[PDB]
Write a structure and sequence with these properties.
The complex is a heterotetramer, with two copies of chain A and two copies of chain C. Chain A has 10 residues and is mainly alpha-helical. Chain A has one helix and no strands. With 233 residues, chain C is mainly α. Chain C has a single domain, classed as Retinoid X Receptor (Orthogonal Bundle). The radius of gyration of chain C is 18 Å and the shape is globular. The chains are: A mainly alpha (10), C mainly alpha (233). The structure holds the ligand CC(=C(c1ccc(O)cc1)c1ccc(O)cc1)c1cccc(Nc2ccc(F)cc2)c1 (2 copies).
Amino acid sequence: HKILHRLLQD
Amino acid sequence: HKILHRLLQDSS
Amino acid sequence: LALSLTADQMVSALLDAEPPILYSEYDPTRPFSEASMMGLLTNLADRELVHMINWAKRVPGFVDLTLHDQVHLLECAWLEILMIGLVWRSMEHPGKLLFAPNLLLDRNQGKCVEGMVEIFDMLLATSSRFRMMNLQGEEFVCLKSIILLNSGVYEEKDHIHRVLDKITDTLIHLMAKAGLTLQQQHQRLAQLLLILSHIRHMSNKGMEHLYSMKCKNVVPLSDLLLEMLDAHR
Amino acid sequence: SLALSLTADQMVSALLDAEPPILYSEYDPTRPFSEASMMGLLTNLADRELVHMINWAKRVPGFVDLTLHDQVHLLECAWLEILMIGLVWRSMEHPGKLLFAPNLLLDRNQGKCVEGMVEIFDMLLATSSRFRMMNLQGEEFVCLKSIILLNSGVYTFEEKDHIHRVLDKITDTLIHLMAKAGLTLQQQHQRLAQLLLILSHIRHMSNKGMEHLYSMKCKNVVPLSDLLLEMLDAHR
Ligand SMILES: CC(=C(c1ccc(O)cc1)c1ccc(O)cc1)c1cccc(Nc2ccc(F)cc2)c1
Ligand SMILES: CC(=C(c1ccc(O)cc1)c1ccc(O)cc1)c1cccc(Nc2ccc(F)cc2)c1
């Protein structure tokens, strides 16, 4: 959860 | 007019 | 492995990871207003955020950090980095802020948004400051990487400080090449890092206004900007 | 200006000598503090420290050579940062504690006595410990504090070129201190950079502190001195 969190994974 | 003005001018 | 890179490599890696200069959705026919200008700056920023996040992954060391730390650093410095970028772009446009190639703004255009004037002036002052210092592209990327790693650092995370020291070594190396004396090398280093103090100032003042806006007149913020924003409130 | 002629040693001795006195808080063991009394103690101490800060400022080499207005601008912009780096510096030998005064030593708790104070405490505490692990020296502290005074408001102004000239001098003084302590050329600039980066966070702590002091002014209560209100309005 958390967009910033998600984007940092891709 | 500012208190700061007085303190700067009367600085010791 | 970020601690085994030579100064030249650091520069190359950072210069390589440089995000593109995005374009505004500025429609020159559309008459300006409060909502539109902040909508313009907000949308541009929202798209830049996506490039910044991916630029962060390419900053030496950033990936070595835990994922929770990465989030913290970015939530802390995202506006600072947006600002130093804006300032670096506007460098050769005195009295003007180059938000985008198609969105070039001067002081008086800020007045269209209340309280925008002070922010524009600090930004303009920073760029002119960059201009009289003749800030170099190689130096800029180092500063921006420093902002990313430093702004949110305050168990034992001396790694981030290890990388920070590396970048400091990189900055000195750059100045030694430019033919500066040792004394000049340390003076310019000081001058550069002290500017970050004022960039921090602009960021906090910026955040401040962004809060107000949100819970007030609704200049709709992107869902990403909203999450980043709450990280300061 | 006579500030540029000074040597590293001369710059140092002049700064140590300008150091403000350590002030005491309104003693009264009546524990624990409420919120009105806590903010009252801090406000009064800060208000008294300010008077001395101005005396200290005038003794910082190069500050006297500034126009009255320039001097006012700088102080108005950096007054809380200056108070904070002082607080932080006093708290160094008291891990997990803020030494507002010799008779006012607040730990992590007690920051709760005021809503939104615990967050400020922890940044302050974090800065203090950072200083401690770096083994910050007094001669370096005075250099840092003077830098904040001259730098914080310089980008919101011949007179500016002057300030930057002095700032360079203080940098020369810093590197000199590090050279004397036996640091390698590389350790010198790494430390220099380290110390200056901390100034960015002291600026941060100040900005947060400012906006709180407003809400506390706008919401009235906790009577602020006219001097404070005047320093405050310069940030609103
Ligand atoms: C320059 C800028 C932004 C920016 C920075 C760099 C960049 O490349 C693009 C934009 C910015 C503007 C809006 C936003 O939602 C996020 C950032 C920005 C950021 C915060 C505040 C302000 N001024 C303001 C905002 C609201 C208000 F009510 C009064 C004043 C301006
Ligand atoms: C530590 C400090 C002060 C200080 C620093 C150094 C020093 O030597 C003495 C005091 C300070 C506190 C009150 C004041 O009026 C001025 C400064 C200070 C300054 C601003 C804000 C805060 N925290 C706060 C304030 C109001 C609120 F509602 C919630 C949190 C703290």
